[PDB]
Write a protein that binds this ligand. Structure first.
Ligand SMILES: CC(=O)N[C@@H]1[C@@H](O)[C@H](O[C@@H]2O[C@H](CO)[C@@H](O[C@@H]3O[C@H](CO)[C@@H](O[C@@H]4O[C@H](CO)[C@@H](O[C@@H]5O[C@H](CO)[C@@H](O[C@@H]6O[C@H](CO)[C@@H](O[C@@H]7O[C@H](CO)[C@@H](O[C@@H]8O[C@H](CO)[C@@H](O)[C@H](O)[C@H]8NC(C)=O)[C@H](O)[C@H]7NC(C)=O)[C@H](O)[C@H]6NC(C)=O)[C@H](O)[C@H]5NC(C)=O)[C@H](O)[C@H]4NC(C)=O)[C@H](O)[C@H]3NC(C)=O)[C@H](O)[C@H]2NC(C)=O)[C@@H](CO)O[C@H]1O
Length: 540
């Protein structure tokens, strides 16, 4: 007679190809990429002949086989593809094979192949758009937004984006290499613990708790291997297979290491660490380089060199070569992008007409033109055009686009920036003709999270009522709210100025729109980005 039917033993059924060490704070120890997951299964036979061969099947296909030598057994074998499998133990002899009932086993990998899709409802004022314009619709999500800002990946209106950038992935390095980080409390030290035992100029994760271990919707079980932002992003990729999710390296406080990359030893170490990062975290679709800024004038007053433009061009070509190689290894398309200053004084330190041949998209940061970093010279922080009272204004969106176009950059590469925040001042005074921007200020406005900066959500929620004046400057294409009794002045984008940027993109055949930062919108900004670029309302 065939053997008795085995009963799978109770036991762990959740396994991982990329293992996460739950008692590690250094990035080198935190993750272990294997070529396959170590899986184990045990069984008992409660009734009958135990057969002479035992086999473990996954969806019918043998993963392990060995002699059946008694009423219980254990099998250890490797599974090299992530996903969920119906696993069975079968005992076989010459008269037949008798298979257990199926037990599902979960083999995790960092493409999210083990996860359910995270397809959450649109919140606040977000309305559904189809991505069918062919234009970029991008936004940044910030790793530290999950604490006080309380804005997690399940709150991103992800159907309404083509590109979701993750700010920020840091480059390892202590004194002299990430000194701008010392301005943020506990931040420099944070990085040094993440990078313990790890060479400088390799990438790491700045806050491993937020990125991988904090409990979040859909990744709450103790033994879900990837939680935090990265676990949710993997499940978001399962819901939106064509969303491009890019890791952004740098930003205002993490850009110092780029200034050392004229040393090709360091540059090559960095490039190889990026390749390793994308091999490890398979949900990411490329890399975004946010070096602020080639030539200096970023957070660190002691850095910046005439060499930086060449380094930026070489970095991009070598990034693209690495990604082209990773693309043919995997069959995947990988993207290389960069977010760049929109000021013409910074643009012309780089030959973007050469660097564009390595890049998919250039995220033109057409925001922060003005703000509480200068109390004397006030202006619209993200306007399309100069205002009527100063038609020679240097920092406008059009001037940064035109500086790029004058280099020879193809218009289709250029993605125009929209701000989901305002900048502002307090004590504005001494202005003519009811235009507060002709005055000077005494300090920054009271921010939502930091001085001088206000989420758009709060502008709409609190500063479009009461004593606040609202004006849409149709020359500049820029809204502003002003409280005459305190002299609080806030410059921001709103649905109409975004619509102007969107029509301008379509008119000039530019690449699309992106925004900083997704948590600060109530829906009005991203709704307008989508509509102004010609995406149809609704779902596919
Ligand atoms: C034409 C021309 O040339 N114009 C010129 C201008 O361009 C120029 O101005 C510059 O222009 C640039 C563009 O050209 C622009 O950069 C780009 O544009 C973006 C927009 O400006 C810019 O945005 C910047 O980005 C920086 C980073 O680079 C941001 O900095 C962040 O700031 C945050 C504070 O607001 C920081 O935060 C804190 O984060 C820490 C972690 O480090 C966190 O710590 C945790 O806290 C919680 C507590 O709640 C803890 O959690 C608890 O415990 C558990 C877990 O342990 C929890 O689970 C739990 O919930 C909780 N419980 C408890 C106890 O409550 C946890 O344990 C903590 N642990 C610690 C200590 O670690 C804090 O919570 C965070 N606090 C808050 C409030 O959030 C954040 O760290 C910091 N990030 C980094 C990486 O540094 C800025 O905010 C952001 N600004 C804006 C507008 O948003 C981008 O960088 C650039 N973009 C791109 C695409 O590259 C420049 O900004 C601009 N610079 C200036 C100066 O303005 C000017 C000047 O040169 O010149 C003109 O001429």
């Amino acid at each position: 007679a065939a053997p008795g039917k085995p009963t799978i033993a109770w036991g762990n059924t959740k396994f991982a190809i990329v293992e996460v060490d739950q008692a590690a704070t250094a990035y080198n120890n935190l993750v272990k990429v294997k070529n396959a997951a170590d899986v184990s299964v045990s069984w008992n036979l409660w009734n009958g002949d135990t057969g002479t061969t035992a086999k473990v099947l996954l969806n019918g296909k043998e993963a392990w086989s060995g002699p059946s030598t008694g009423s219980s057994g254990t099998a250890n074998f490797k599974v090299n593809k992530g996903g969920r499998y119906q696993m069975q133990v079968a005992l076989c002899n010459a008269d037949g094979c008798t298979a257990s009932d199926a037990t599902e086993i979960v083999v995790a990998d960092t493409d999210g192949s083990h996860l359910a899709p995270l397809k959450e409802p649109l919140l606040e004022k977000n309305k559904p758009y189809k991505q069918n314009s062919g234009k970029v619709v991008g936004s940044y999500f910030v790793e530290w937004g999950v604490y006080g800002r309380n804005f997690t990946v399940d709150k991103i209106p992800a159907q309404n984006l083509t590109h979701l950038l993750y700010g920020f992935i840091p480059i390892c390095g202590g004194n002299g290499i990430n000194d701008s980080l010392k301005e943020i409390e506990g931040s420099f030290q944070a990085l040094q613990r993440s990078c313990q035992g790890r060479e400088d100029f390799k990438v790491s994760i700045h806050d491993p708790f937020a990125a991988l271990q904090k409990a979040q919707k859909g990744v709450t079980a103790w033994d879900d291997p990837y939680k935090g932002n990265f676990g949710q992003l993997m499940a978001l990729k399962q819901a939106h297979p064509d969303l491009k999710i890019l890791p952004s390296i740098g930003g205002w406080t993490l850009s110092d290491p780029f200034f050392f990359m004229g040393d090709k030893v360091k540059r090559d170490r960095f490039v190889g660490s990026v390749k390793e990062f994308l091999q490890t975290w398979k949900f990411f679709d490329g890399v975004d380089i946010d070096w602020q800024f080639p030539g200096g004038k970023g957070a660190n007053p002691n850095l910046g060199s005439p060499q930086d433009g060449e380094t930026y061009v070489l970095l991009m070509k070598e990034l693209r070569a690495m990604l082209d190689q990773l693309s043919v290894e995997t069959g995947r398309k990988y993207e290389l992008t960069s977010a760049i200053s929109a000021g013409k004084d910074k643009i012309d330190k780089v030959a973007y007409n050469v660097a564009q041949n390595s890049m998919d998209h250039i995220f033109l940061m057409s925001y922060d033109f003005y703000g509480a970093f200068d109390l004397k010279n006030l202006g619209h922080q993200t306007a399309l055009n100069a205002p009527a009272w100063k038609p020679d204004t240097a920092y406008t969106t059009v001037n940064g686009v035109n500086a790029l176009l004058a280099q020879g950059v193809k218009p289709g590469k250029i993605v125009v920036g929209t701000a989901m925040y305002g900048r502002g001042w307090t004590g504005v005074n001494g202005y003519q003709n009811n235009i507060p921007f002709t005055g000077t200020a005494t300090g920054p406005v009271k921010g939502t999270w930091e001085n001088g900066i206000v989420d758009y959500r709060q502008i709409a929620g609190q500063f479009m009522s009461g004593e606040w004046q609202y004006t849409y400057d149709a020359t500049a294409e820029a809204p502003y709210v002003f409280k005459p009794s305190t002299g609080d002045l806030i410059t921001f984008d709103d649905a109409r100025s975004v619509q102007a940027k969107g029509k301008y993109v379509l008119d000039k055949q530019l690449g699309g729109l992106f925004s900083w930062e997704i948590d600060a919108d109530n829906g009005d900004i991203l709704n307008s980005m989508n509509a102004s670029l010609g995406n149809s309302a609704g779902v596919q």
